[PDB]
Amino acid sequence: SMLQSNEYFSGKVKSIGFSSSSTGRASVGVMVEGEYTFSTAEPEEMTVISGALNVLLPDATDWQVYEAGSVFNVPGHSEFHLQVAEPTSYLCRYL
Amino acid sequence: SMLQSNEYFSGKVKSIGFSSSSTGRASVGVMVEGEYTFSTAEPEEMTVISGALNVLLPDATDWQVYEAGSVFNVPGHSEFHLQVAEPTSYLCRYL
Predict the structure, then answer these.
(1) Structural contact between residues A90 and A31, judged by C-beta atoms closer than 8 angstroms
(2) Residue A49 in contact with residue A90, Cβ under 8 Å?
(3) What is the rounded CA–CA span in Å between residue B70 and residue A94?
(4) E strands, chain B, where?
(5) Alpha-carbon distance B73 to A61, whole Å?
(6) CA distance A90 to chain B (A)
(7) What is each CA distance from B37 to A27, A64, A76, B29, B72, in whole angstroms?
(8) Cβ of residue B95 closer than 8 Å to a chain A Cβ
(9) Could you give the CA distance from residue B38 to residue A76 in angstroms, rounded to a whole number?
């Protein structure tokens, strides 16, 4: 199995990518305070492990605050937006 | 806030370290198939995010299988042992 460390946005997001039978392709990582735009290929399932994300999804008007334990889904071939206050850890699965 | 990528055991364990108000000092990471010995400073709280760990704790005889969603605690200044099959992601908090 391959594990790889990834960095995005000048180091403000860092993750470990992997693949397993139970998750499919996935990442676990952390984001620090900031505002970020992400583009998906496959649809993505995001789980907030610790901290919180303000989430704007493409097909719905309102931002929503997702605290630790919450899960949201992003469609494929789409753009979504996040805002972060305290460092926030997450699991992302590429569905 | 600082985020740092860490590698252990010749790359078989990789993690992102961070610190936040809700977690204290913590890591999120992934381990691949293998058997690992860890030494603690502070006591540690481990959460299995995906996959599974076979866990041997210092003050109890039996190994126990911790699957996704489960949480265990390791005392400080101690050694514990893990066995991994499929890649397994985790959150570790330094208490």
Answers:
(1) yes
(2) yes
(3) 23
(4) 4-8, 13-20, 24-31, 34-39, 44-50, 52-56, 64-67, 71-74, 79-84, 88-94
(5) 42
(6) 9
(7) 24, 41, 40, 16, 16
(8) no
(9) 39
Resolution expressed in Å: 1.4
User: Which of B82, B94, B77 minimizes the C-alpha distance to B13?
Assistant: B82
b or e along A11-21 (b: 16 or more beta carbons within 10 Å of the residue's beta carbon)?
ebbbbbbbebe
Distance between CA B61 and CA A83 in Å, rounded? 46
DSSP A19-43: EETTTEEEEEEEE-SEEEEEE-SS-
Q: Which candidate from B23, B29, B91 shows the least CB-CB separation from A16?
A: B29
Tell me phi and psi for residue A46, to 5 degrees: -110, 130
Give the whole-angstrom CA distance, residue A70 versus residue A50: 10
Spatial strand order of the sheet with B79-84 comes to B34-39, B79-84, B52-56, B64-67
Domain boundaries, chain A: 1-95
Q: Beta strand pairing status for B88-94 and B24-31?
A: antiparallel
Chain A interface, best mutation among B20, B33, B48, B66, by max A CB count within 10 A: B20
Task: Name the structure determination technique.
Answer: X-ray
Do A23 and B50 count as a contact with CB atoms less than 8 A apart? yes
